[PDB]
Design a protein around this ligand. Structure first.
Ligand SMILES: Nc1ncnc2c1ncn2[C@@H]1O[C@H](COP(=O)(O)OP(=O)(O)O)[C@@H](O)[C@H]1O
Ligand SMILES: Nc1ncnc2c1ncn2[C@@H]1O[C@H](COP(=O)(O)OP(=O)(O)O)[C@@H](O)[C@H]1O
Ligand SMILES: Nc1ncnc2c1ncn2[C@@H]1O[C@H](COP(=O)(O)OP(=O)(O)O)[C@@H](O)[C@H]1O
Ligand SMILES: Nc1ncnc2c1ncn2[C@@H]1O[C@H](COP(=O)(O)OP(=O)(O)O)[C@@H](O)[C@H]1O
Ligand SMILES: [Mg+2]
Ligand SMILES: [Mg+2]
Ligand SMILES: [Mg+2]
Ligand SMILES: [Mg+2]
Lengths: 97, 49, 447, 442, 443, 430
């Protein structure tokens, strides 16, 4: 136990976890501007273009092979991954929007 | 399965020996690491022994 | 001694042989001769140590095996630690992932260092016991916990947010923890030694620490030495800290660079961070693209431009990317904004002194006549050809198990391994056996 | 206190609407060149033209980049200015045309000014005001909410519409905590507890902020600026916490992509719509390219096409070559390496070499900048050396003389120190002669 | 049975204790000077003192260059790392050539690691959670400890485990009757499987069955696995831990080579030096071998000069056959062996001489004996003559079809008619060129 | 099975030889090339021997003179269960993979490994399946009845197989197979088939896997997908070393055996010099399949170099290899080959038409006639006569040009065609 404790101690963060956030920390305040309405990120553009997407999307992947998606992602009934880990993965995919 | 023949006879975890330090920065800070290195519980096992 | 102690080509040289008057001793710090070059190197070292000057380019010139790389290594050694010193080769910048200009920019940003200091107010101490009135009132009834150090111990009153935070990362007393005064962050340092005998198999995170000594809370300052390039890499990516180790920086845009420059200037004005100028060394710069030369010419005129030293053993030859031949292998515009240092070939006395210092370095003793023969051979041959012969002769003597290296062992070593001129002569005498430039070759001995 | 071949240039050294003085702003000689530069400065300050290109050509060490630095200084920090190199455009990640267009867009800037009315202070109390409902009912009806604000050198209470209830409930701020309320937009923002309540607990995870100074009602104007390229990259690059694309940005490497023209035109349209209301104010910048002789012929053609755009800013080009061949074509020979069609689209500004007296003045001014003192004899020797070998060699030699004088414990450089520097440090010509006279491959 | 491919008849250099090479030893004949030089190089490598020393051996084709480069490795032993390489393999699409060369350089030098681990293993007799009745205010509901009894052939033992190990084993989904594996160091828990004692419990069962382990319950052991530094760098650059979905996605992606920074190598060097100072590990320098170095570009040649001056640079050997040629990537630089003069200055030159007719005959005899074939004296003499007439490799390759030709006629000896028939059915380079000189359509 | 309409090498199957390795004048669609056929048979016996590996054999000859046919016959005679890789030289030039890596993958693809595993399984018609929910008496009770031709009994299901059987809908009366060791369910159809005997039987399953497939599988989290998508991406060398060591241990333990297949590279003359230099080393290692190459060109310039080398290959590689030369076909062989091709394509040829076709083939080329045979048939059923006459052959000959006639016409009318300098004339007048 002495050897294990002595060996488990010298685990050093290579740079830090506080250096990272101290260099992220921007002294510039919130300074809210019309940039919120000026940026319009990708998700907003996807959301507000519903009509065009609905009207102009036609083609389908005429040839498909079901159950290939699960195999490609490495999660299925039998694989090299643990059952609990894969279950957590599918749960996260279920709850991610 | 055929390739998973016992390797623990001739394998090293390589994380117990702190050779994968590249992920230590995700959760540990510098001052806490320095303190935990300074506050080792050594010399107590020697006393008990 | 901290680095790997394997003996390399440049191991004997340590620092510079200059004095406080910048006078190079004839044989000191593992270097021989080159008094003018050593004095120039000392002048450049003092220039760097002054730190008030930047954006200067210095050239090192000399035939092969004259001491240019040795001089650069000695300059780096004399500079010591805590000062960045980037040593790269010319062919290294040619990368498939990164443009050559971006590679040069990253190399420049690496060579300049920054010191940042931070102050923290932490309360670290073993907790005696925690009591919360979950039944008397319920819902953060303002519980109390006692923290003990080796010299002092008090009792603290805890609010609702304290209880909510402490519910996460549950603490069962008898543990050494540190609480943050500013953000109230709960950090578990380690358990006490009294819990060592609770079980026979511990968890991965289980650890034991001694009780902290002194005041319950302390004010401490920490200083970090992080160069700019790390700062740009970290700022560029959401998780850029991995990009340092992996190396896939990804061609950081100049916008992040100017933002980092503004931030650094602001920190310097506030006094939080200080700038430590460094040295960038490019070896074998004779090979490089002209675009790199033009970018170097433009970038040498910036405030954050470290002193750049380059070496080249080429004469008036063709420069890569251009058909014409330029003097010294470099375009003239770069030579305009540069200072050239020339090194001369060594003398027989210098050669034998260097051979003696090399033999002493490798823990190898030599006979006087053996040293004289080695010096005579190295005069006609090159100096670098003698060290390998010395090592081989020592191995032969060890095989014969007779103390020092003898003249016979050196002669046998020279017979076994040929010089470049001898190999050229032998190839020319037997040009049919070897493959010619046209692909024609003769295999069968019989005609 | 660091200098690198610059920082001794402070503006163009001109006067109030006239010919530039002999010595001003660290500039000596070349009166016509900096006069033309000042004319260009006035032209860009007019902020009416688009895609105006000028080019300056001359010998090495003739202040070609110095003039660009001077005009950059004269324009001011607010005006965008993007230095660039001929070798910058060659990018592995994306084609050269996209990089050039991105730099062009980065040259143009934009300024935003906003005014906000702020009601801030410590929350004295929160008391709803009851009133009879317009529609008959036994439920409680609230017509106003009374909030009291306390600040340094002033306190006040405000009567507000009852819809502020949602915001005040969301902010989880109760009593004696500094809050921020905007007049017309409504809503509230908690900023931290009052500093007077800090001592109320032995320990605290929550910071305490001091009470706002001055009146509770404030009227501050905020100014923010940003270039068009930043807007384009922000529009293109996705953002988010947990949407699939958010960590699809993770586990991968974000790289430059050819931004479509439809996104750029949409950004231009929204910028025009906002600037029609007076909130925005577009300010064109200046793009500076050095060693333009190193640009490819294809890049030259794309520059020819792009200079006719309605948003292209003023670009300035420098070249130290004469009758040469444009890269990418072995037969085309044009002055300064620029194809003749592109030369036809710009204006050429000449630059002339300096004289001995001008060289001496430059050396003495640089010495004053470097905070070291020389003697008259040493200064004359340095000027003669510069006129003999080159100006840049003399400029570089300054610091070694200072170091040598420091080693000899002297404060001023003498002839002996400059002689020691000249023997220790060589210039191009002596090195070339040594190369010619040596056969050891050196 | 046993396969032979132009090799495997060389067991080493074959040198005596005084360094003098025997005339015939270990499948080698002649080249006494070259064998002595290679033995000296072997001794230098085993000295574990010099770093970055480089040698180059040159000679005509089929002079034994590759044979010597393999014999030196055979003499060195499997423990010392030895990475063969070809000059063409350096050019990689994913990453620049310099990164590949540095990666191979770090692959060359090796290191051995010793660490002690204790393992609790055996069949699960019972497991019992223990819940403390005192809420203590700090927690709502948790098990104070869990008691598990382990059984094996030598005996049985009980254990007391903290809640973390209990959570791990519960996640492992282990009931009573399953053989498990507990690691004391990291707390790792893995289910080996169900013990074979319950094989007859059901008529059929998906679960496999494992025999009861030996050893009482708890064992102490150490591992002396040797790993080169390049594996350490790869593991540091490509971590395998973490259960995050992002980590699984990263694991799914193909491993692309990347330019590992010098900082990471410096940190690895620092920790390795600390461990070797502590005596827990030992560093063993290796050997890097590159064949057909003439294929290298001038940029790689230039970077080799910088690489060879590093502290941890191993011993590297080079092979070449061309004479006065132009370095690839240049225009007129003509240098011996297609190697720039500075690099030649940095290395040492070893010459390989051609073979005599008697030496060729002895080589043919040894090769035929290795292939387990019977050759008549007259047929062997004819083969030696025709090999001296065209090439040694032609005779060595022709040694094989003669066996099939003899087998077709059911004879067990090589006869002059058989080798003549083989020569009729198979033409050497000279005959092919001569018939190519006079032909209609490229022949 | 193995769908295919018609191939230029479809007629040839299995080469042709005797117990004394003496080629027959006509055997299984192979005509002529007696010395070449005997050499090919020698190489085939060498491959089947397996004692010697890493040897290079070259095939040389004029174009359209039994060069790819020899390799096809060698592959066919080698039979199945033996690796055989046939790749054109230009295939190795990949944008995402290094040429050296592609060559190494091709080399590894030609060595196959056979591994044997013994498994127990039960099968037969299922007549009764009962499954119950958990009670305090028992967590899960499940009984199923599988009836065969000889047997019909009931097994007890211990939870896990209950879950497996409930995972997919199973109806009584269909033939299924249950693997006890793996615990998987396989449905063999409905009772269409019939049972055979005992439910449980002893058998071993043998898998043939190449070294490259093993490396790809062990190189990734899910490597076997890269077997098809082709995104292996420069497998690390230590992986290959580890695979080699493990294969050596498996062979010494008898768990697996190696099959030294054949690697065939066509149009080697256009391969780069770096590829040849790498092949020089790759042919001298332990695991190295036999290598056969075919180059039409002779005394040309090696790609990647300025000088011209004989046969288009460097001299050292030629020293490493053995050269086999093919001879030009003769008229009596050409007519037999054309007759065999017509038989393969099911075309009836008159004697005079066959003689005229043989004369034309001798005059111009064999490929021209072997292409004209099919096109003449379209005219044949255009005239509604099954047999092909001289008139149809002449009509095809005049309708479809030859190389010589086209060259002569181009020489006569070079004005109409685009010149090398780009000059061309479109206008007729002036
Ligand atoms: N002052 C010196 N004292 C001792 N050895 C030296 C000195 N200068 C150079 N050397 C020797 O020269 C070698 C380095 O030569 P180098 O300058 O790298 O050649 P090049 O000029 O081709 O780069 C080293 O092995 C070193 O031992
Ligand atoms: N009027 C001036 N006053 C002071 N220094 C000058 C003046 N003109 C040029 N210089 C010097 O010339 C240098 C600029 O060189 P420049 O002509 O831009 O090089 P290039 O010709 O390669 O573009 C600056 O370092 C500056 O010190
Ligand atoms: N002295 C020797 N004794 C035995 N075999 C030899 C000897 N020299 C060369 N060989 C044989 O020659 C074959 C090829 O020689 P190699 O060294 O590959 O030629 P190169 O030197 O051109 O690379 C090897 O298989 C080896 O068995
Ligand atoms: N012995 C043969 N028997 C039957 N057909 C043959 C024979 N030799 C060649 N061929 C014909 O020649 C064609 C193959 O041409 P080939 O000689 O491989 O061209 P190249 O020489 O350019 O590789 C095949 O379509 C086949 O029909
Ligand atoms: Mg050097
Ligand atoms: Mg300039
Ligand atoms: Mg060879
Ligand atoms: Mg063919």
């Amino acid at each position: 136990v002495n050897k294990l404790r002595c060996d488990r101690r010298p685990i050093f963060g290579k740079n830090l976890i506080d250096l990272l956030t101290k260099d992220r920390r921007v002294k510039y305040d919130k300074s809210s501007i019309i940039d919120n309405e000026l940026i319009k990120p990708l998700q907003t553009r996807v959301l507000d273009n519903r009509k065009i997407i609905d009207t102009f999307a036609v083609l389908t992947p005429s040839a498909v092979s079901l159950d290939m998606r699960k195999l490609a992602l490495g999660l299925n009934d039998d694989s090299s991954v643990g059952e609990n880990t894969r279950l957590k993965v599918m749960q996260n995919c279920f709850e991610v929007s | 399965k055929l390739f998973k023949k016992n390797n623990q006879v001739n394998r090293v975890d390589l994380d117990f020996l702190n050779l994968v330090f590249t992920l230590n920065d995700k959760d540990l800070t510098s001052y806490h690491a320095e303190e935990i290195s300074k506050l080792t519980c050594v010399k107590n096992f020697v006393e008990e022994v | 001694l901290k680095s790997l102690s394997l003996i390399a080509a440049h191991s004997h040289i340590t620092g510079l042989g200059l004095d406080e008057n910048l006078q190079p001793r004839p044989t000191s710090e593992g270097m021989v001769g080159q008094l003018q070059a050593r004095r120039a190197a000392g002048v450049i070292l003092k220039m760097v140590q002054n730190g008030t000057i930047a954006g200067r380019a210095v050239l090192v010139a000399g035939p092969p095996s004259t001491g240019k790389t040795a001089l650069a290594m000695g300059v780096s050694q004399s500079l010591g630690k805590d000062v960045p010193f980037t040593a790269i080769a010319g062919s290294e910048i040619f990368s498939l992932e990164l443009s050559k200009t971006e590679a040069l920019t990253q190399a420049f940003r690496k060579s300049i260092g920054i010191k940042i200091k931070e102050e923290t107010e932490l309360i670290e101490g073993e907790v005696v016991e925690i009591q919360i009135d979950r039944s008397i009132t319920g819902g953060h009834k303002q519980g109390k916990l006692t923290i003990k150090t080796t010299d002092m111990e008090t009792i603290y009153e805890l609010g609702n947010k304290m209880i909510d935070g402490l519910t996460k990362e549950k603490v069962l007393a008898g543990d050494v923890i540190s609480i943050d005064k500013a953000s109230g962050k709960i950090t578990k340092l380690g358990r006490s030694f009294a819990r060592s005998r609770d079980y026979d198999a511990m968890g991965a995170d289980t650890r034991f620490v001694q009780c902290p000594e002194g005041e319950l809370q302390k004010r401490k300052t920490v200083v970090h030495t992080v160069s700019l390039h790390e700062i740009d890499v970290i700022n560029s990516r959401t998780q850029g800290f991995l990009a340092l180790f992996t190396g896939d920086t990804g061609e950081i845009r100049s916008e992040v660079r100017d933002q980092i420059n503004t931030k650094v200037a602001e920190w310097k004005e506030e006094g939080k961070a200080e700038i430590v100028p460094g040295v960038l060394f490019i070896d074998e710069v004779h090979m490089l693209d002209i675009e790199c030369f033009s970018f170097i010419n433009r970038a040498l005129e910036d405030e954050f431009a470290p002193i750049v030293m380059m070496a080249t053993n080429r004469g008036v030859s063709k420069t890569r990317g251009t058909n014409y031949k330029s003097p010294h292998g470099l375009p003239l515009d770069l030579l305009d904004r540069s200072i050239i240092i020339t090194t001369k070939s060594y003398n027989e006395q210098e050669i034998k002194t260097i051979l003696s210092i090399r033999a002493q370095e490798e823990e190898v003793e030599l006979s006087s006549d053996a040293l004289d023969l080695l010096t005579k051979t190295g005069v006609e041959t090159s100096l670098r050809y003698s060290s390998n012969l010395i090592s081989v002769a020592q191995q032969i003597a060890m095989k014969r198990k007779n103390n020092t290296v003898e003249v016979e062992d050196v002669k046998r070593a020279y017979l076994l391994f040929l010089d470049s001129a001898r190999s050229v002569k032998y190839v020319q005498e037997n040009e049919s056996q070897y493959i010619d430039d046209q692909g024609n070759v003769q295999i069968s001995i019989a005609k | 206190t660091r200098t690198a071949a610059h920082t001794h240039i402070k503006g163009l050294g001109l006067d109030e609407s006239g010919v530039a003085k002999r010595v001003e702003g660290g500039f000596v000689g070349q009166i016509e060149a900096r006069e033309a530069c000042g004319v260009i400065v006035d032209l860009i300050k007019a902020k009416k033209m688009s895609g105006r290109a000028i080019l300056l050509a001359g010998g090495p060490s003739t202040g070609k980049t110095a003039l660009a630095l001077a005009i950059s200084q004269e324009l001011g920090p607010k005006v965008p200015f993007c230095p660039l190199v001929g070798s910058e455009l060659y990018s592995v990640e994306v084609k050269k045309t996209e990089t050039l267009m991105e730099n062009f867009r980065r040259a143009i800037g934009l300024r935003i000014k906003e005014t906000k009315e702020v009601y801030e202070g410590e929350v004295t109390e929160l008391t709803p005001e009851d009133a009879e409902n317009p529609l008959g009912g036994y439920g409680k009806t609230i017509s106003h909410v009374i909030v009291g604000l306390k600040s340094a050198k002033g306190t006040k209470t405000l009567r507000l519409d009852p819809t502020i209830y949602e915001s005040i409930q969301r902010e989880k701020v109760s009593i004696g905590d500094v809050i921020y309320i905007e007049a017309n937009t409504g809503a509230v923002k908690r900023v931290g507890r009052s500093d007077a309540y800090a001592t109320e607990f032995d320990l605290e995870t929550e910071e305490y902020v001091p009470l706002p100074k001055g009146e509770v009602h404030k009227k501050k104007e905020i100014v923010q600026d940003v270039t068009l390229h930043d807007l384009d990259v922000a529009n293109a690059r996705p953002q988010g916490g947990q949407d699939v694309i958010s960590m699809m940005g993770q586990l991968l490497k974000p790289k430059k992509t050819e931004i479509t023209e439809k996104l750029r035109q949409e950004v231009n349209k929204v910028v025009a719509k906002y600037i029609d209301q007076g909130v925005a104010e577009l300010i064109p910048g200046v793009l500076f390219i050095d060693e333009v002789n190193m640009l490819d012929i294809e890049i030259f053609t794309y520059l020819n096409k792009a200079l006719e755009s309605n948003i292209a800013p003023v670009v300035v080009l420098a070249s130290n070559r004469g009758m040469t061949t444009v890269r990418g074509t072995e037969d085309v020979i044009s002055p300064h390496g620029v194809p003749p069609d592109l030369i036809d689209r710009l204006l050429i500004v000449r630059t002339l070499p300096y004289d001995k007296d001008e060289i001496r003045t430059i050396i003495e001014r640089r010495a004053t900048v470097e905070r070291l003192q020389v003697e008259s004899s040493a200064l004359d020797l340095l000027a003669t050396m510069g006129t003999e070998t080159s100006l840049r060699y003399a400029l570089q030699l300054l610091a070694p003389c200072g170091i040598l004088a420091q080693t000899s414990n002297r404060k001023e450089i003498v002839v002996n120190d400059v002689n020691e520097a000249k023997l220790l440090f060589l210039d191009a010509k002596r090195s070339t002669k040594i190369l010619e006279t040596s056969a050891n491959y050196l």
